Design a protein. Structure first.
Ligand SMILES: [Ca+2]
Ligand SMILES: [Ca+2]
Length: 322
């Protein structure tokens, strides 16, 4: 697909530190790519495997879907045995890691399994930990950072934690976050991006070489989002731009490597209150074609994946590591 709405490095989108308002951002409207269901499913957790196949899920029913981007064929290999799964991150060894929220209070955690639902492993046990995990991102060593999705605006119970490659140690990276949601590592893995949903803030965290210590005055707030509900999941491209799905806003915002907004992707029907639940953005491996999932549960509609071409090709994350 080459005739898809595309984002270019023109105007202020090509500036290192653009001074601009959201209404002035280079904007494009996403094209419908594939309807998952006529029924309302809370789509989330987009992630491609080493073979370029798309894996995603729906929070409330816990269905795990596998999609052939080429044929548009949709399969449903298995259903999560844990309540409210919210993200899927594929390991370099092929396993699917599934972050779940549980009861939203503390019964969340992370489990791993084959693409067919076999060999269920408790990476982060649910009942023994207070965590309710929404997303995660693997570093090149096999360790990973995850977001603790808890609390609300003035009750910052959330935060970000790092799990060692052997999965035996959990280390706090940054805490006192009002519902940490989205998370991403820069291409050099020295910068961690985190979205705080209930406070509408974007966090940029500069890390030391050990991957756990924050550089002096290294955790900052480069951007204050606006509108109900707030920032959700995010991913980066090979140019270190950050794509942030805005939950309840029917759009995705794109920031350059310095945390400045350079692009905006609208979901068809948002003005009328449709498809406002845009939750996750992800690139088709080896290309700059972006997929975005959203749903019309609020308006009694269905679940749909949308698409556009981003500023650059998707980044080669952990599952694509050789
Ligand atoms: Ca837990
Ligand atoms: Ca999310």
């Amino acid at each position: 697909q080459q005739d898809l709405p595309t984002l270019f490095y023109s105007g202020k989108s090509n500036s290192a530190v653009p001074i601009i308002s959201e209404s002035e951002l280079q904007t494009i409207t996403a094209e419908p790519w594939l309807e998952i269901s006529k029924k309302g499913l809370q789509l989330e957790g987009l992630n491609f495997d080493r073979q370029g196949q798309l894996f995603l899920l729906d929070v409330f029913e816990g269905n795990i879907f596998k999609i052939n981007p080429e044929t548009k064929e949709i399969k449903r290999p298995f259903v999560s045995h844990k309540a409210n799964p919210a993200a899927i991150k594929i390991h370099k060894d092929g396993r699917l890691f599934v972050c779940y929220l549980g009861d939203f209070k503390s019964t969340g955690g992370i489990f791993a399994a084959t693409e067919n639902g076999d060999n269920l492993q408790d990476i982060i046990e649910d009942l023994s930990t207070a965590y309710c995990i929404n997303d995660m991102v693997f570093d090149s060593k096999g360790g990973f950072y995850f977001t603790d999705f808890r609390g609300y605006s003035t009750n910052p119970l959330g935060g970000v934690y790092y799990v060692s490659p052997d999965f035996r140690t959990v280390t706090p990276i940054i805490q006192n976050i009002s519902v940490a949601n989205g998370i991403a590592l820069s291409t050099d893995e020295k910068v961690l991006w985190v979205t705080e949903t209930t406070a509408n803030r974007l966090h940029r965290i500069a890390l030391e070489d050990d991957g756990v210590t924050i550089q002096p005055f290294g955790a900052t707030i480069p951007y204050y989002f606006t509108g109900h509900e707030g920032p959700d999941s995010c991913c980066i491209d090979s140019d270190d731009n950050l794509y942030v799905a805005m939950y309840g806003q029917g759009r995705v915002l794109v920031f350059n490597k310095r945390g400045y907004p350079i692009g905006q992707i609208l979901i068809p029907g948002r003005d009328e209150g449709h498809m406002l639940r845009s939750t996750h953005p992800q690139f088709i491996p080896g290309t700059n074609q972006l997929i975005i999932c959203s749903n019309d549960i609020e308006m009694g509609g269905g679940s749909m994946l949308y698409t556009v071409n981003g500023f650059a090709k998707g980044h080669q994350s952990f599952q694509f590591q050789l």
